[PDB]
Curated annotation (Swiss-Prot):
The keyword Iron applies. Monomer. Binds 1 heme c group covalently per subunit. It comes from Nitrosomonas europaea (strain ATCC 19718 / CIP 103999 / KCTC 2705 / NBRC 14298). It is found in: Periplasm. This is Cytochrome c-552. Monoheme c-type cytochrome. Probable electron donor to membrane cytochrome oxidase and to periplasmic nitrite reductase.
Length: 81
């Protein structure tokens, strides 16, 4: 949930419903709706960073996020659709 997202600074660069710096969380949700192991995939983007899927500004690695927290954030975002 978004208390986790706040602690881990996700919810400045992102918003649920609309693009800020990073894409809207509900857009991530809809894009990967049918990706399998989408949650592992998104925890991995969250921990190690992302480049070029949504724009030319990359997401740096979120090095202080735990695996469990990255997985919980990814699961939460997936439920957003
Ligand atoms: C807090 C720890 C988080 C979480 C859970 C996520 N982010 Fe970001 N993010 C940012 C940008 C510019 C992008 C697009 C990057 C690109 O074009 O490749 C993203 C992308 C994501 C994704 C999508 C990954 C994918 O493969 O589609 C996800 C799941 C995600 N974020 C979650 C920008 C930022 C930030 C600005 C500095 C910060 C801080 C975060 N994101 C933090 C988080």
């Amino acid at each position: 949930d978004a208390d986790l997202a706040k602690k881990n600074n996700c919810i400045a660069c992102h918003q649920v419903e609309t693009k800020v710096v990073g894409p809207a969380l509900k857009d991530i949700a809809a894009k990967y709706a049918d990706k399998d192991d989408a949650a592992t995939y998104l925890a991995g983007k969250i921990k190690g960073g992302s480049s070029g899927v949504w724009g030319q500004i990359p997401m740096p690695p979120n090095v202080n996020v735990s695996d469990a927290d990255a997985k919980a954030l990814a699961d939460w975002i997936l439920t957003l659709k």
